[PDB]
């Protein structure tokens, strides 16, 4: 009986990850019976050192992720057992981004200390370290509130309007080349550089869901953040 045979686990052994990185378990064969999922979860019981509570979420018939309830300790070695498989990984700095829809800001802290790039005359900027002018999703396509984690980081990725439900050649379609792209949902939500959107930054929520930053702020956050680091969206 190898129905719950585990092919692999993320983080990999010795991987360096951000401080909300889930434990992602990939099974050797799909578990197509949702009733067998609770037994599968028990067979892949996640035991970390330091101890952490979490919640299982199935991403596919053969992938379940265990989402920690709290952040891992930064700059640490986390020991990890996933049903007998003994592993470990490392965390880097706690790089946390908090988007405020009402304040039109994106606040970046590193290990608790708010910080941003060294500012180099005609654009909004706050005198407060780490607080970046941002533009969230407009009321038609709002940025959803929640607790996210960085799923991937890409340079010069092309984003279409088909991600929010609009063909490219449609009245309000788009096809953008985006310089710095920090992906925070599998659906296609990003923190990213939006130079065309410079006037709205810090003032208006004019994007279609994504968290828009200046190129300089996006570049700094992109270079600071790691896959697994948390991103909070608040009203
Ligand atoms: Ca990493």
UniProtKB/Swiss-Prot annotation:
GO terms for molecular function: acyltransferase activity; peptidoglycan L,D-transpeptidase activity. PROSITE patterns: LD_TPASE. The record marks 210 as: Covalently binds to acetyl group of faropenem. Signal peptide: none annotated. Residues 95-234 form the L,D-TPase catalytic domain. Pathway: Cell wall biogenesis; peptidoglycan biosynthesis. The active site is at 192 (proton donor/acceptor), 210 (nucleophile). Probable L,D-transpeptidase that may perform as-yet-unknown cross-linking reactions in M.tuberculosis. Is not able to generate 3->3 cross-links in peptidoglycan, using tetrapeptide stems as acyl donor substrates. May function in the anchoring of proteins to peptidoglycan. This is Probable L,D-transpeptidase 3. It comes from Mycobacterium tuberculosis (strain ATCC 25618 / H37Rv).
